[PDB]
Design a protein around this nucleic acid. Sequence first.
RNA 1: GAGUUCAGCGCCUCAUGCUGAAUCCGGUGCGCUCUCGACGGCCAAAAUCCAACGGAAG
RNA 2: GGACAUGGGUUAGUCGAUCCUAAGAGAUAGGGAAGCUCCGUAUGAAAGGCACGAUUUUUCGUGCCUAUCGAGGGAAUCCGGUUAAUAUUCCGGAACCAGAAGGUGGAAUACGGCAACGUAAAUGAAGUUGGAGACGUCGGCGGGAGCCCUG
Lengths: 378, 129, 235, 416
Amino acid sequence: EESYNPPEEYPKKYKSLRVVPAYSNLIKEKFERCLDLYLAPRVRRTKRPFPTRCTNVFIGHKGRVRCLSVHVSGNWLASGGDDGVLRIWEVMTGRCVWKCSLIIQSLAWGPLSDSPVLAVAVDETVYFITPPIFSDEQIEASKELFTSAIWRRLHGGIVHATVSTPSSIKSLSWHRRGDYLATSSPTSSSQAVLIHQLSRGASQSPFSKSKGSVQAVTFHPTMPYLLVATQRYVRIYNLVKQELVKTLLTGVKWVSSLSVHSSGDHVIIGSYDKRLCWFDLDFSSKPYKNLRYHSRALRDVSYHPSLPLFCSGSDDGDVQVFHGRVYSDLLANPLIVPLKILRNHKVVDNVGVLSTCWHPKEAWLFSAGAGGEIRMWT
Amino acid sequence: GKVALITRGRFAGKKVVILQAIDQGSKSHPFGHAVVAGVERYPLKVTKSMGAKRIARRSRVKPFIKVVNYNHLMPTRYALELDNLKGLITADTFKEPTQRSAARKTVKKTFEEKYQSGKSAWFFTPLRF
Amino acid sequence: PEVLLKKRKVNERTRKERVEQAIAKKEAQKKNRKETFKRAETFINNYRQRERERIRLNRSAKNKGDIFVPDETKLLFVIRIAGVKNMPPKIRKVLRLLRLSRINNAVFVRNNKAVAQMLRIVEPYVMYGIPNLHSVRELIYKRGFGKINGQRIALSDNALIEEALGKYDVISIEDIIHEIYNVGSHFKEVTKFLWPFTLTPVKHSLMEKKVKHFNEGRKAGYCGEEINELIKKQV
Amino acid sequence: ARVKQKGKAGAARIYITRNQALKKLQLTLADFRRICILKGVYPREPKNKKKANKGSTAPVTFYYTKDIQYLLHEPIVQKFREYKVFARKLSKALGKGELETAKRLEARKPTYSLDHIIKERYPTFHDALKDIDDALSMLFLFSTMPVTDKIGAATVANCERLCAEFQHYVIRSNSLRKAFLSIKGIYYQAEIFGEQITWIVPYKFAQSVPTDVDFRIMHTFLEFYQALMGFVNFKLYNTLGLRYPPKIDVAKSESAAGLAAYELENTSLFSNFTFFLSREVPRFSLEFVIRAFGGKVGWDPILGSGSPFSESDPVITHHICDRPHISQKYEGRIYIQPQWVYDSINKGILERTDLYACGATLPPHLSPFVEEKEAKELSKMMMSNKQRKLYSKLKNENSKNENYNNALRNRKRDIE
RNA sequence: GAGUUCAGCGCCUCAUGCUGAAUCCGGUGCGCUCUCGACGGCCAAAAUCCAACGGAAG
RNA sequence: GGACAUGGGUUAGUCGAUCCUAAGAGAUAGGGAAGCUCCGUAUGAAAGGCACGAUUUUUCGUGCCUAUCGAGGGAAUCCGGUUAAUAUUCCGGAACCAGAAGGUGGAAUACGGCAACGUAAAUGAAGUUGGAGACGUCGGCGGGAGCCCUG
């Protein structure tokens, strides 16, 4: 319907036949038609836990928050960054009462509430400090936990145990009982992973011979097994037997971090290749599902310990929230689907969401950005 | 800004320019390291007879930013400096792959502009061996 | 049940490269085929023709100021069959006066005493006759060329005809043919506007592409309605 | 048995390249294309390319080995060589000066007939009627092209003869259904034996050849279609009882009489109507279209003889004319524009004359052939082969144009 | 679950099955045989397969 | 009785041959010879195919590279059981190789480490190069296995 005067579009419109010329391209378009009949390859074909928008914006960090963590009670959040100043924010009020500064690569609170000791690792040194905000009995109980890596025993800077490692610590983990501390340093080759026992006040390397860099490390939440996320794969070692358990290949160029549910069967791992892989130990070594939501490198992924939800943070500034129900039945496969896609986060130096923390009680996500802004998506 | 060549690793025989020198030593690299951005895929010889999309595809170049030791590198008399090539090299870009990816994208864009302008022809052209 | 036709496997890049090389090789050949020799015989042949032509003019003009004046057609059709190198001065001007400046040109002429006389002067070089309406129709509708602002312009748009011939009540191609066949008042203006056609002899069968100086056996002089058949073959 | 070698079966065996197909048939490229044009032969892209190319990578056209082996026994291939023989014997005769054995040789030049090509390519008449539309577009296109050195005059005569006989058939059979207009030409559309036939008629005009079309190819297609037209029309006339070919009068044909030379020795939309054709309209298209629906047709004598009516006869119901001025306007022959006729053809309904009358604004012409966020984000990531892109391609160009033209109606009402 | 050795049963019967178990912990070699590997010296070809350089094609 | 009479018995994708060459034999190109025949096999042999192309005058143009027989060489399977006479073949059970297409999923529009090197994938034409196949002999030592010895 392109002709004299069609209202379809206004090619060209012509008032009458006289103004209508001869088409010059007709012989050409027919010439290509010929080519069709013997040159065109004739291939035949068949023709709901609501983590709502963040309403609390915590500010005060002069720089990017390297890592953020929530205490056992969940009412206090401790974060550290390259600025060297540690800020503790109250969940209920958002206050920065504990603003003592005392580059913290990571900060984690002890699994035991009766021993509220937060271990903050700056470069190659990690200090287990008991803040005065916690109860005196809790502080006293934390000191009794401790009082390869050299161990040594300021605006309320109550330092209990300081541990120095051969390499700069990148990933820090604490045992369920709190007597073991796992330090992962990708820089080191022979002693990349170090295991420190607080009861004996010493540290050692569980691996007799270490080859390859390790990007993340964690312990199983059900059995005495340690999972170390290397650059390419993740190896699970039974610390009781000091032997391997299972090796899961993420199928990515460089793994970023790993997260595990409380059951210890289904895990979600983030990679630097903008990949989010959900793997189940009872399904296969290969991931059960894969995701590439992030437009930039997938920084980290977090699964809520209680709520059946998981969150993934990336440098793209977009955080993906998914709800996943896991059933113990053999025939009931884990049903995981996305729930929300957080946005409206500032990106600086191609870095967006860096650290994401889930509330110990509800499905509330605490995300700290490169600008020192913490968004609490309740 | 000094042009350097890598004689070791996967990026063997690739010319690089020192965006930030780490020869003073670092915990990650206890040696005379150097974080430099080079060219892995040299642009193809674009012909004026080719189409605009064809010319850009041939002229496309794949950059590569990596840290290598001084011993693994080789200094050269030639040198090229760019305004966008100063201050963009840091450990944060190396630490964050997304920052590294943006750094690689920016470096390739600068190199493509350099190739389009006809500058750094010797560096742009891959070296034979 | 869906046979997707894909892109050609022709590599249009190399095709035009071959075409450009083909044109590059062709122009060199023309610039190489230069300054051929001329035998002493052709100088004679020109002289024999020139005296043969010159004597014909004297007998035609003097003592033969009589023309048989082809009748029952106001409009004739004249085409130039051949010309002689080192043209006689008289014929050289007259052919230009009839717009037949180059060989194989086709021009309409209104029949009268004057035109038939000039045709009689240049008779040994032209094949002339009476075109029928149909033959004139295909000539304009397949080989008609206009002179818009003085360039070689195809009669591709009726708007151009109206633009350049509106004030003489000529609006369309069909107006042109009706005027020309009827030889109206605007016949002179239309014929002035019309660019001469080019009926170069056609060479299809193998015998023609090989016989030397093949011109379809075109004689010179009156041919009646055979010019219509010649046009039918030619157009 | 031995370890079977690579590429000895499957996609590395059936698929055979163009160069191999040349040396297997022992042909030059130009002859190979000719037998590929005449037969039904076309490249077929293999699913696994480097597998089908002995591990190579370069882009190469492929054919079915079964297809090439059919061309090995084609009897016409011999008639290609017999002409290669004939050409050298005619060159021999002209070289020695035998201007007579040259004349007799050319009389006895070798020939090939496409009778068995047509039968083996189209078995059933319905197969022909389906795959004949391009043939109609082809032959009709050529009848208005000046004869060149590439295309012989008699071939043009074959187009004109075969073109008119088809026009006579449709008018006789009243099988014409629609006739659309465009800058391409007059898109005709009829139906025969249930199947639908469509083509395009070029504007009969003093066109120019772009000097880039390779006329060698176009010449073989005419040598193919002009064979098809004779035998397709032969069955139609035998079915309709007409004697094929219809007789042609030379004297009438040299007077631009159109269909009048040949004698055939809502179909009634214009049965009770009489039309006259003025001397400014496309008589060739209008003669065919009106007589297809019973319209009694006369035309200006300057367009050609054979007009049953004259200018003065008032029996004409509609004196069609697109000239902006009508000095001697008649009565009872209401003067309308040609777009009225085609609009009546498309709708099969007598249209309104005055809106199409002389000097009136032309009416437009019509082509007769023509929770949510969650439910849209889960299948974008939790599925493998990604056919989800079908919306992004199929729906996008339909939604945008639908949004665009719907805004045309609102914006055009604002103009009014 | 096989095999090997014990103990028992099935019964006119070509019923040739049936029931229990064990089938384990070691060491040795100027021994003998062979194999592989780090040294010391004394002084085939062809068939076939793999990889690299290379940068035509998009 | 190995005598005669009368019957039965050798089962293979994986074991060998068939596949290859060595020294040489050796047809052909040639040349001798009255002749059966002889010499000759790199020899004054036009001695084998590859790609490109809207189809090129609708008569093929352009560009590249230079026998045969003959026995150590060689892809891939073991267990248990089974007969008057059979087993890597038969049976039961368990694998491997080669080749073949399409289908699914995965990635795809390759990677990290100064490094040796490593991963689930991770374009490569013509042309160029290498390794394996494919390598002499003897003596001592280390590692293991089995036999034998012994608690």
